[PDB]
Amino acid sequence: GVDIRHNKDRKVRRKEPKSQDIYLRLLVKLYRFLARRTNSTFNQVVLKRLFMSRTNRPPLSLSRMIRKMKLPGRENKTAVVVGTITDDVRVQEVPKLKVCALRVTSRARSRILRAGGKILTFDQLALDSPKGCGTVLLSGPRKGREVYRHFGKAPGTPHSHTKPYVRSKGRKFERARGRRASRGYKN
């Protein structure tokens, strides 16, 4: 015997996607080639984001993308996102930025290609910049889901803010004791 450990020796990350999409399976073969061979840390983040789930690749709208490319320095770079590009209705005009994503939606690649920008995939990204030089790899708001407002301490602990699972919103649905100091108590 050697020690008394309560094993965590099997790390619990993803070494491949659980998808059987044969076009993502060739991006994996392309980028895990480029991960272990080009000696860059851009291509290791992009390789591990392709392994991620549909939840861990949240969508990215058009006005977080052009808002994080109005910044100083970003004037000629490419916005790489491992995940889909949607478009805000909120935004009015679009600049001529150059994007690179898995799966741009149809109205998003019409308003990008009206302004004169260019849409890319991860095949012609590697032919353009193998090291990933001059790239702003952007992410989506992964705690933007409806699921995270149900996550927290407990909905009936002090201050809590935790949104109980009620089946329907309204009066006479979880609003009486524990929620006002008259009827019982208040957390």
């Binding site: 209705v89 909120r90 009015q92 407990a154 909905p155 009936g156 602990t157 109980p164 699972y165 009620v166 009066r171 006479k172 649905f173 979880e174 609003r175 009486a176 004791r177 524990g178 929620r179 006002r180 009827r183 019982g184 957390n187």
Partner: protein, 147 residues
């Protein structure tokens, strides 16, 4: 898929995934929401605070058509018309503002939401908020009310 599930993998093992001691029977805690104040109390607070009691006024026979008003706030307001309108609106002839009526788009009240663009409008809604109509009166627009 009966193939892909836990009971094929758990066949051969005696208590079938439920324990020698606890020995899963039928209904050890009661059926349904039994004992919600008594022995399941700590579950019903800490996860459903508010579950017991009267809280308001009773309204017999409500009709979900009298209270019907959908809302659009001002960012979703220029998508009610074409994009061919607003590009035609601002190209320097006169103060010709387009209509945007939310009632033939299925909305009744116009709420406020920042970044209404620099063009003037005339917006025909049934109701307005005061934040909404003073964004409109600050882009040179007008606020006409309809029944």
């Amino acid at each position: 898929p009966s193939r892909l599930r836990k009971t094929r993998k758990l066949r051969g093992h005696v208590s079938h995934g439920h324990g020698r001691i606890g020995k899963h029977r039928k209904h050890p805690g009661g059926r349904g929401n039994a004992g919600g104040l008594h022995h399941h109390r700590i579950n019903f607070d800490k996860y459903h605070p508010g579950y017991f009691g009267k809280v308001g006024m009773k309204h017999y026979h409500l009709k979900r058509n009298q209270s019907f008003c959908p809302t659009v706030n001002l960012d979703k307001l220029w998508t009610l018309v074409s994009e061919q309108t607003r590009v035609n609106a601002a190209k320097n002839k006169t103060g010709a503002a387009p209509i945007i009526d939310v009632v033939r788009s299925g909305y009744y009240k116009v709420l406020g939401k920042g970044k209404l663009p620099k063009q003037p409008v005339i917006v025909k809604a049934k109701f307005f908020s005061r934040r909404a109509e003073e964004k409109i009166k600050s882009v040179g627009g007008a606020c006409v009310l309809v029944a």
